[PDB]
Amino acid sequence: AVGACVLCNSQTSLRCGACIRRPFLCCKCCYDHVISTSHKLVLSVNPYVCNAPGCDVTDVTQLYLGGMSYYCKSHKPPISFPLCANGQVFGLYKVTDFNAIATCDWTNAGDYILANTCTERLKLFAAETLKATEETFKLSYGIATVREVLSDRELHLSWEVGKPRPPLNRNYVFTGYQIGEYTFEKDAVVYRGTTTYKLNVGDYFVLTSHTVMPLSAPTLVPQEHYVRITGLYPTLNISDEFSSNVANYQKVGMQKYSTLQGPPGTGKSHFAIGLALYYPSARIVYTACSHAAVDALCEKALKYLPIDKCSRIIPARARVECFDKFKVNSTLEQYVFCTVNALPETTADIVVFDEISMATNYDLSVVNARLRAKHYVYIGDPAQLPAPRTLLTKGTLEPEYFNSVCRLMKTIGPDMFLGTCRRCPAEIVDTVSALVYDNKLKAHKDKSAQCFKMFYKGVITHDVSSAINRPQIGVVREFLTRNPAWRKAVFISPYNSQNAVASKILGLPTQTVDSSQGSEYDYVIFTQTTETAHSCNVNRFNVAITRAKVGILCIMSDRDLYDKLQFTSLEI
Ligand SMILES: c1csc(-c2ncc[nH]2)c1
Ligand SMILES: [Zn+2]
Ligand SMILES: [Zn+2]
Ligand SMILES: [Zn+2]
């Protein structure tokens, strides 16, 4: 119970007992909090509650100090001061934005906008409160048990009736019972158990409500501009291969932190691994939110960096399969590849945080608390997909509000920008350059002449809320008979249910737009499925079409995005 205020750091014994995170509030700030919100419980050494037997008065405005104890107006002695008077709540060592974070339910977009526009301490308070809320909301869902086993990939479950049923897709990871993490995709549902055990009739699962740990470090450390490279030792031999990034690697050694906007296939991984070849003595920790992003950095380092100084830090409880080729869990190796949630207590010359659009302010803070570094490099693209905000249902979260790093890239601009897309045919590069990069993304490849668009709204059917468009899958089928070279294509769509129908009918490997991020394929077949805000989202549209290296077929529902696609229009 000893500490400083979240709004001005003025020392106090006062905490708000109504806040889900019980923040320390000073005498003036605690008052301006209780008088403006429904939050009336004030904690300190002892809570502010009437001491008189059986008295349930807990509002600090209806309370007074009688001698050494606290009492309401019905119990107070003649010599008693009200706890609320003269803009202060009585406490030791004797704003609008804080109120809104402390009381919001996180279902509105404006709640996240504010969690990013506020001061740095209010950013941590909001990040902590939001994560606590998201975890307490996980309990609100019911417990599901095994009813029977059809085969090695199909089953049926008993639900606790009453308490809501959480959504069935590859976005909700259950913790079976201690039979490893599990995922679900739709009466015969499919079980994607991260561990191979015969799911006995009687075992049950639950959404892992991993507890929220208070935030110490800021989302972004204070910026420092240096006039010479600091604590890093460059080379004058750096291979031609990484010479396009030499002026940027120098900017990296001349700032405490630096931002890199890298559109799809502009060489983000190349930049990250090449930074190690530019400062060859530097100890570098490569971090990202997902195991897939960490693994993609593992793959690029396997080609250019010495395997003996590499290590893939894997969490004790192995969820799904990750990197196998590096010396596992060696914390003192020069190059360490580990996810934000598995980051051990250590220091580094440079920390590279890749896929920055997927990072939350909580993630930004964790990295700053578990890693003390000379240089921090954030690589990503605010034009790509952000972390799914489960509680958010009203309003769309704009890129300047994804996190503090995205916020900078969208207002002041990124420190560095990779302007040449080497992956996509010019039809795709030109489309997304106009759509999300203000015509600053350039095509390295020529037009492949294999980028097609078909405007076909079809028939939207719903598998609960996840959507299906069978006429769009049927249009893909007719196209595949006439274009057998498209037999190697990946079927992408914004919905899992669409992907499941297309997996059975077309037989193509499947992918949601969100899971396609970071990956590339020669041929991509995208069916838009619906014209919802989800399927029409420009960051999602951008990721979807920028997966193709050679050609893409887009079956569109929205006329806007269809007309924007600089592709050859097909017929039927
Ligand atoms: C629902 C809310 S906005 C929306 C939309 N935006 C673009 C196309 N459809 C659908
Ligand atoms: Zn409060
Ligand atoms: Zn204060
Ligand atoms: Zn009383």
3-state secondary structure of 84: strand
* Contact assessment for residue 475 and residue 453, using Cβ atoms and an 8 Å cutoff: no
* Contact assessment for residue 262 and residue 517, using Cβ atoms and an 8 Å cutoff: no
Structure token pair of residue 370: 């578990």
**Structural domain harbouring 491:** 426-564
Q: Give rounded-to-5 percent helix, strand, coil for the chain.
A: 30, 25, 45
Other Cβ atoms less than 10 A from the Cβ of 44: the count is 19
Pocket of ligand 1 contains residue 558 by CB under 6 Å: yes
Structure token pair of residue 88: 């202060």
Which CATH number covers residue 538? 3.40.50.300
Which residues face 255 on adjacent strands? 225
Pocket of ligand 1 contains residue 532 by CB under 6 Å: yes
C-beta pairs of 316-321 under 8 Å, 24+ apart in sequence: 319/173, 319/180, 319/181, 319/194, 319/291, 320/181, 320/194, 320/291
Q: For 155-261, where are the alpha helices, taking DSSP H only? A: 246-252
Ligand 1, atom 4, residue with closest C-alpha: 533
Task: Specify the pairing of strand 521-527 against strand 490-493.
Answer: parallel
Burial class (CB in 10 A: 0-12, 13-18, 19+), 522: middle
In angstroms, the CA 324 to CA 315 distance is: 13
* Residue that is written with structure tokens 């930074």 in the block: 275
b/e map of 283-320 (b: 16 or more CB within 10 Å)? bbbbbbbbbbbbbbbbebbeeebeeebbbbbbeeeeee
28 Cα–ligand 3 center, Å: 6
* Contact assessment for residue 567 and residue 431, using Cβ atoms and an 8 Å cutoff: yes
Cα separation values, 519 from 23, 25, 183, 212, 532, Å: 42, 46, 21, 31, 24
Q: Is 268 annotated as a binding residue?
A: yes
349-352-355 Cα angle (round to 5): 170
User: Which amino acid is present at 392?
Assistant: L
Q: What is the largest CA-CA distance in the chain?
A: 93
Q: What's the Rg (C-alpha) of the chain?
A: 27
Going along 326-471, which residue ranges are E strands?
335-339, 346-353, 371-380, 416-417, 420-421, 442-443, 451-455, 461-463, 466-468
**CA pseudo-torsion sign 560, 562, 568, 572:** negative
In angstroms, the CA 301 to CA 1 distance is: 47
3-state secondary structure of 149: strand
- Nearest Cα to 103, choosing from 159, 38, 53, 161? 38
* Contact assessment for residue 173 and residue 236, using Cβ atoms and an 8 Å cutoff: no
Cα separation values, 292 from 160, 210, 339, 399, Å: 34, 21, 9, 22
466 Cα–ligand 1 center, Å: 16
* Contact assessment for residue 326 and residue 299, using Cβ atoms and an 8 Å cutoff: no
Q: Which helix (H) or strand (E) holds 364?
A: helix 361-370
Task: Give residue 483's Cα distance to chain centre.
Answer: 38
Ligand 1, atom 1, residue with closest C-alpha: 533
What region, left, alpha or beta, does residue 245 occupy, with left being phi > 0 and alpha being psi -120 to 50 degrees? alpha
105 Cα–ligand 2 center, Å: 13
Task: Specify the pairing of strand 204-207 against strand 144-149.
Answer: antiparallel
Ligand 1, atom 3, residue with closest C-alpha: 533
In angstroms, the CA 20 to CA 520 distance is: 42
User: Which amino acid is present at 537?
Assistant: N
Which residues face 560 on adjacent strands? none
In angstroms, the CA 155 to CA 153 distance is: 7
Other Cβ atoms less than 10 A from the Cβ of 72: the count is 18
Cα separation values, 571 from 428, 454, 459, 551, 563, Å: 20, 7, 18, 17, 15
* Contact assessment for residue 411 and residue 434, using Cβ atoms and an 8 Å cutoff: no
| DSSP designation for 421 | E
Cα separation values, 495 from 155, 350, 469, Å: 21, 38, 10
Q: Is 16 annotated as a binding residue?
A: yes
C-beta pairs of 481-485 under 8 Å, 24+ apart in sequence: 485/523
Ligand 1, atom 6, residue with closest C-alpha: 533
Q: Is 19 annotated as a binding residue?
A: yes
In angstroms, the CA 562 to CA 557 distance is: 8
518 Cα–ligand 1 center, Å: 25
User: Which amino acid is present at 228?
Assistant: R
In angstroms, the CA 370 to CA 365 distance is: 9
| DSSP-derived secondary structure for 264-329 | TTSSHHHHHHHHHHHSTT--EEEEESSHHHHHHHHHHHHHHS-GGGEEEE--SS--S----SS-TT
Give the orientation angle of helix 96-103 with respect to helix 120-139, to 10 degrees: 10
At residue 229, what are phi and psi to the nearest 5 degrees?
A: -55, 130
At residue 176, what are phi and psi to the nearest 5 degrees?
A: -75, 160
Q: Is 176 annotated as a binding residue?
A: no
Q: Which helix (H) or strand (E) holds 515?
A: helix 513-516
497 Cα–ligand 1 center, Å: 20
Other Cβ atoms less than 10 A from the Cβ of 328: the count is 12
In angstroms, the CA 491 to CA 511 distance is: 6
Q: Which helix (H) or strand (E) holds 122?
A: helix 120-139
